[PDB]
Amino acid sequence: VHIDLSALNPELVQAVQHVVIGPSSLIVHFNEVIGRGHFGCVYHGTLLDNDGKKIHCAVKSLNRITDIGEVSQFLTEGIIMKDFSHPNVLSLLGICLRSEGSPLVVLPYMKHGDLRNFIRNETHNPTVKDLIGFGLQVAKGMKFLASKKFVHRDLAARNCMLDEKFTVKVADFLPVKWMALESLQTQKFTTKSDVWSFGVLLWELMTRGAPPYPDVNTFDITVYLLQGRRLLQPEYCPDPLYEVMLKCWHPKAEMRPSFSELVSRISAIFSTFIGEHYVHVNATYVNVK
Ligand SMILES: O=C(Cc1ccc(F)cc1)NC(=O)Nc1ccc(Oc2ccnc3[nH]ccc23)c(F)c1
Numbered sequence: 001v002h003i004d005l006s007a008l009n010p011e012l013v014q015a016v017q018h019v020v021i022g023p024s025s026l027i028v029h030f031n032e033v034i035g036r037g038h039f040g041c042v043y044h045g046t047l048l049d050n051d052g053k054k055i056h057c058a059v060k061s062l063n064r065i066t067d068i069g070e071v072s073q074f075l076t077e078g079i080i081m082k083d084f085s086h087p088n089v090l091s092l093l094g095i096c097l098r099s100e101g102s103p104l105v106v107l108p109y110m111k112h113g114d115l116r117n118f119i120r121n122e123t124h125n126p127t128v129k130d131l132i133g134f135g136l137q138v139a140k141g142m143k144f145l146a147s148k149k150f151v152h153r154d155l156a157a158r159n160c161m162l163d164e165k166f167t168v169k170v171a172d173f174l175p176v177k178w179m180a181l182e183s184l185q186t187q188k189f190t191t192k193s194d195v196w197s198f199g200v201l202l203w204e205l206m207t208r209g210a211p212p213y214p215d216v217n218t219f220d221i222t223v224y225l226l227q228g229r230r231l232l233q234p235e236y237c238p239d240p241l242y243e244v245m246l247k248c249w250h251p252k253a254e255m256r257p258s259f260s261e262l263v264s265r266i267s268a269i270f271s272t273f274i275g276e277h278y279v280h281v282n283a284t285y286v287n288v289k
Pocket residue numbers: 034035042058060077080081084089090091107108109110111112113114145152161170171172173
């Protein structure tokens with residue numbers, strides 16, 4: 001590589017070598033990619049853990065240049081997950097270190113991709129229990145992150161991964177439609193504002209991926225909310241769960257339930273179901289963006 005890297009920041013990007021995986025225990029399949037965005041070239045990959053022992057994963061690579069800046073963010077955006085060790089939070093397997101260019105960020109591969117798409121798929125047959133369970137898992141992930149003073153900022157069904165055992169992992173690939181009033185007013189985000197977002201996530205779940213507030217100009221959703229509105233109760237959403245969304249949307253940020261109380265309340269509601277209520281999509285929501 002022809003970039004001066006040690007000009008980086010030892011104390012800033014300290015410990016990228018603490019979670020390093022020797023350029024051997026990992027294998028990349030540059031011919032099969034799954035990531036498409038303004039940035040983010042993710043290909044399927046296999047990394048042999050321990051000494052057996054093949055593990056399927058998603059490798060995060062970067063595009064040559066620019067200077068030491070893009071290299072700094074990419075790495076920093078990887079050390080963000082270093083300590084994130086919770087079954088409902090998307091973790092970092094490691095970062096492989098080779099030269100000649102791009103560095104690698106390795107994530108556990110997720111068979112079912114993102115939550116929103118999984119639920120929108122007409123061939124899937126979720127029950128109220130299934131959907132509430134996904135919501136309970138997200139809450140458990142958030143309770144973990146909140147314990148670590150980590151403010152997500154973009155909690156939403158599109159940012160949650162679903163793995164082969166159907167384990168939801170909170171992740172992150174302006175989302176004003178998921179934002180609390182006070183944050184729409186002052187672009188300041190807190191744990192209490194992630195709760196507002198969680199409520200909206202619960203709604204996406206109960207409607208099976210419908211877009212919230214389809215009719216409103218997206219621009220000012222604030223004037224809309226201030227009129228005294230909230231998302232309507234989805235057909236298959238149990239009354240008690242709807243009372244929870246209404247609590248997550250409390251006008252006073254501090255009156256909102258914490259993620260611990262949410263785990264408690266939702267787990268109760270979840271226990272009452274046996275899996276005998278199938279959830280269908282509302283005709284008026286189908287094909288809506
Ligand atoms: O999510 C983060 C940081 C983070 C982690 C947890 C948080 F709560 C908040 C932020 N890092 C990412 O790089 N996110 C991400 C999320 C999804 C990604 O794409 C996949 C990864 C594994 N399996 C997949 N199947 C389809 C896409 C896919 C991906 F490459 C990266």
